[PDB]
């Protein structure tokens, strides 16, 4: 996360740290949607083997000992069959745990978005243990987050003078030049959310790709509303 701040302990209870099991190395974020499923990005899971991945929930400061932290083995991984590694279209996946995730005040799922809402200009949040600068060293110990503005796809597509922003994508950035706030390396697969008047959070995007980080280009995310049907069918049939 670039231009953001430290999250308070378990401020975003659905946040997941996806790691290489043998090295406990965080490489992507994720979002809990129920006690057996986590939403992530396709580019994070493509080619991964269930036995070599660990999902860590209830995390905050990865460098501290914790009684809240839960480490889960992965049962199966589902990458969107239409994922295009070249265009980044359909950059979505869902991961199933071997056992049920324990839910409490510190760990819980995030809500699904309303597919019939593009969230244009809504204030949003993005959290993760990604680098704080493009090219920075991965990864900061304490969970961070930043608030962003969800742009129109046309605007985002206009800024990316050499790349296409598809309808299944959603972008978010700051209102001050796109050089202050953004998600970065390590935040991928993580959540881009919005909250209602009651403080209830909904998953509207999945950290996907971008040029640099707060380097003049908006961050690009996989539009969860667009892939909502796929996520529902996948977690319901597996």
């Amino acid at each position: 996360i670039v231009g953001g701040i430290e999250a308070r302990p378990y401020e975003f209870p659905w946040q997941v740290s996806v790691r290489r099991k043998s090295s406990d190395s965080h490489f992507c974020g994720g979002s809990i949607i129920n006690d057996r499923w986590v939403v992530c990005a396709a580019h994070c899971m493509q080619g991964e083997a269930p036995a070599l991945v660990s999902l860590v929930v209830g995390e905050h400061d990865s460098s501290a000992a914790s009684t809240v932290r839960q480490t889960h083995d992965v049962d199966s991984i589902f990458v969107n069959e239409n994922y295009d590694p070249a265009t980044l279209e359909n950059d979505v996946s869902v991961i199933k745990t071997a056992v049920a995730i324990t839910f409490d005040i510190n760990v819980g799922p995030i809500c699904a978005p309303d597919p019939a809402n593009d969230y244009v200009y809504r204030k949003s949040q993005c959290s993760g243990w990604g680098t704080i600068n493009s090219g920075g060293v991965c990864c900061p110990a304490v969970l961070r987050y930043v608030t962003l503005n969800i742009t129109t796809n046309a605007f985002c597509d206009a800024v990316y003078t050499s790349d296409t922003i598809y309808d299944d994508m959603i972008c978010a950035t700051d209102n001050t030049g796109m050089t202050d706030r953004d998600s970065c390396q390590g935040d991928s697969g993580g959540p881009l959310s919005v909250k209602d008047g009651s403080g209830i959070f909904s998953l509207v995007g999945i950290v996907s790709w971008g040029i640099g980080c707060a380097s003049g280009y908006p961050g690009v995310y996989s539009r969860v509303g667009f892939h909502a049907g796929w996520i529902t069918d996948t977690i319901t049939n597996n």
């Binding site: 953001g4 701040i5 308070r8 378990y10 401020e11 975003f12 209870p13 659905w14 949607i33 129920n34 006690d35 499923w37 839910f103 005040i105 510190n106 819980g108 799922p109 995030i110 809500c111 699904a112 978005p113 309303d114 597919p115 204030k123 949040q125 959290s127 987050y145 930043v146 608030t147 962003l148 503005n149 700051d174 209102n175 001050t176 030049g177 959310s193 909250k195 403080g199 209830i200 959070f201 909904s202 909502a228 049907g229 996520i231 529902t232 977690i235």
Partner: peptide, 27 residues
């Protein structure tokens, strides 16, 4: 409406009433 992926209870709840309220300047 949003699909219900978690029929077991309420989704999207944070213990902090002001969770994720970091300011976002208008520019």
């Amino acid at each position: 409406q949003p699909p219900v992926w978690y029929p077991g209870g309420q989704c999207g709840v944070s213990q902090y009433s002001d969770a994720g309220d970091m300011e976002l300047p208008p520019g």
